[PDB]
């Protein structure tokens, strides 16, 4: 598994002090136990931009709808494989109470099914250029990122499964906010290629878009980086595949060990089955009705997701 949304804090501090200051300011300013975090289901209008250079990349509506279903299961703890969560970690599992719905009104007020399809001469898209997010670079412009979650689906290449933009970048880069997913790994079963065939590449990416970091701290394997979530055990490097429970490492060397089945690890889709309650608090805090960076998304979410 490969994702382009690392936050290697040691590297950022050494090379980009303004970015480092923005992240530390971000972490100092989060108020998880605020009275103005909504208690109700948070509704997210989604628009999926299919950007395709061949027929394989022009994935079906059924395939896209299955991804929306997977997001609703994972973000509402309605995933059947929650039965796989070790009992030692089950008391920490969270229900984000976030719902996703394809948009039914586009930004100019036209009716839509929430899926855009754009043909392109670009053979492979680059995370560095973010070219998939711009019509003039062969991709497709984002839809008002204060009101829609944009999910681009394209050919990212054999190595990258997806990438997201973090919320601390929203103020400086609002037009590229959203998530990009490799077309081979979008939706559940169907055209999705094993072992990333259960729609978890988007769950993981959407977690980044909702302020979560890789559980091991993007620190090359050390015990020094953090994901800023206390209820995710300190972890060395990423886990891949599907380890056996319990897996201990040099950072958490006692049972129940590391939470390799967390969506924010790098394990196979079928190996993942939970967010924690700490991760859920972080995600929902973005919708704080007083200071939540994504609070405007709830104002017209109902109108934008009704035909
Ligand atoms: Ca942690
Ligand atoms: Ca680590
Ligand atoms: Zn990631």
Author numbering: 21 to 327
Task: Give the text the authors published on this PDB structure.
A variant, in which the general base/acid Glu225 was replaced with alanine (E225A), lacked activity. This variant was used to obtain the intact zymogen for structural studies. Previously, this strategy has proven successful for other MP zymogens. We obtained two different crystal forms for native and selenomethionine-derivatized promirolysin E225A, which contained one and two protomers per asymmetric unit and diffracted to resolutions of 1.4 and 1.6 Å, respectively. The only significant deviation was observed for segment Lys51–Arg55, which contained the final activation cleavage point (Ser54–Arg55) and was flexible. Promirolysin E225A has a compact structure of approximate dimensions 60 × 45 × 45 Å, and it splits into an N-terminal 34-residue PS (Arg21–Ser54) and a downstream 274-residue metzincin-type CD (Arg55–Leu328). Tyrosine-switch Tyr286 pinches the extended segment I together with the upper-rim-strand segment Leu181–Tyr183 of the CD. In the capital interaction for latency, downstream Cys23 Sγ binds the catalytic zinc at 2.11–2.22 Å in the different structures, which is closer than typical Zn–S distances (2.31 Å), and contributes together with the three histidine ligands to a tetrahedral zinc coordination sphere [Figs. 2(c) and 2(d)]. Activation does not lead to substantial re­arrangement, i.e. the CD and the active site are already preformed in the zymogen and just shielded by the PS. Thus, the results herein indicate that latency for promirolysin and uni­cellular pappalysins probably operates based on a cysteine switch featuring a cysteine imbedded here in a conserved cysteine–glycine motif.
